[PDB]
Amino acid sequence: MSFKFGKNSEKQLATVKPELQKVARRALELSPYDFTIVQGIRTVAQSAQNIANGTSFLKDPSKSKHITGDAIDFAPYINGKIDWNDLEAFWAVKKAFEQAGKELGIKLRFGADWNASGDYHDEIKRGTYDGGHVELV
Numbered sequence: 001m002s003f004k005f006g007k008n009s010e011k012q013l014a015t016v017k018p019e020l021q022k023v024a025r026r027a028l029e030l031s032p033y034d035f036t037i038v039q040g041i042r043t044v045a046q047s048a049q050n051i052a053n054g055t056s057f058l059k060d061p062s063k064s065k066h067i068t069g070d071a072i073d074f075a076p077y078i079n080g081k082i083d084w085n086d087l088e089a090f091w092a093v094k095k096a097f098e099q100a101g102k103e104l105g106i107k108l109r110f111g112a113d114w115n116a117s118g119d120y121h122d123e124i125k126r127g128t129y130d131g132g133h134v135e136l137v
């Protein structure tokens with residue numbers, strides 16, 4: 001319990017361009033259940049070695065927003081352990097990210113409205129981290 005950004009996590013966020021990391025740190029406390037950082041910024045080995053597969057001409061590993069450092073990925077911590085199956089808590093945890101961004105002013109928003117347009121493309125019923133990824137809006 002009371003998880004905190006390790007040496008790798010603290011760095012990932014410490015390498016972010018914007019101040020989105022702020023909401024993350026505060027959220028860890030504000031939110032009911034702690035959370036562990038998974039990814040924050042892309043090093044010179046990630047997007048660089050991303051072309052290790054084969055296609056070097058199509059070198060452009062921008063599948064996410066981490067490239068622009070305007071987004072990060074985290075995991076909802078519960079019972080002193082990672083809760084990837086307990087999406088229930090994910091609601092109380094993520095809710096802190098959106099609530100923390102409004103008070104801190106930091107740009108924070110998830111992909112919950114994008115799917116509202118028609119159907120659930122994020123697959124919130126499946127329990128995926130589709131919308132989990134937080135980015136600046």
Ligand SMILES: [Zn+2]
Pocket residue numbers: 039064072073133
């Ligand atoms: Zn991500």
